[PDB]
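In the design runs reported in the main text, the only information available to the sequence generator was the tokenized backbone. The following block is the verbatim input for one such run; it is reproduced so that readers can re-run the procedure and compare outputs position by position.
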């Protein structure tokens, strides 16, 4: 509904990106709402129906994709067949499919979002959210958490994501969003934000 009213669309996998990506946009001084850009969670990893809607045979709306490497090869061939149809992409290896897809604003993260943020400078703020959302954690789990903060290179990823999923991925990301800053922005998110910003700004510039 908002898609039909938007100048651009940022496609993301789930609720964590749905709230974290606009928070990074604001500290990058890229004002998504003022620019008419909507963030849309596809609720999974199937981006193809949305690329069909926004591609040249659909509404022809500038859009970007943020997705996790984890089979990302097939996921990206599925959208490249739409946005670059009908060219064969079957003979490309994964890294070739990935570097082609960046041309269309589709960007892959080599990690998953929350562990990257924990290791990449948001360790202590994520601890405070977890302890506020889960205030009766057993002492063993508190000790492991303090230990990850003291050495974000040593983290139990399964347990971290277990705690975040227990809080709720969307709820957790909203509570974390006020802490994000420009210098801890993951590269794939900065790339996607700049790509969609550039496309919308180029539209305005072409009025002369
Ligand atoms: Mg992601
Ligand atoms: Pt609890």
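Verbatim output:
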């Amino acid at each position: 509904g908002e898609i039909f009213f938007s100048r651009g669309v940022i496609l993301v996998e789930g609720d964590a990106e749905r709230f974290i990506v606009p928070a990074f946009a604001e500290v990058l001084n890229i004002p998504l709402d003022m620019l008419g850009i909507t963030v849309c969670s596809v609720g999974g990893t199937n981006f193809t129906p949305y690329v069909k809607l926004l591609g040249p045979e659909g509404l022809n709306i500038p859009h970007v994709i943020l997705t996790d490497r984890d089979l990302v090869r097939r996921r990206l061939i599925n959208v490249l067949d739409v946005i670059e149809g009908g060219v064969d992409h079957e003979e490309l290896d994964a890294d070739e499919v990935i570097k082609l897809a960046e041309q269309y604003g589709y960007f892959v993260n080599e990690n998953t979002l929350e562990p990257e943020l924990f290791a990449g400078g948001l360790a202590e703020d994520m601890q405070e959210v977890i302890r506020e959302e889960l205030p009766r954690l057993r002492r063993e789990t508190l000790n492991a958490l303090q230990q990850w903060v003291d050495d974000p290179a040593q983290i139990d990823e399964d347990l971290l994501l277990r705690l975040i999923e227990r809080i709720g991925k969307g709820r957790f990301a909203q509570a974390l969003a006020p802490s994000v800053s420009e210098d801890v922005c993951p590269a794939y998110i900065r790339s996607a934000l700049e790509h969609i910003r550039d496309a919308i700004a180029l539209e305005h510039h072409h009025h002369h």
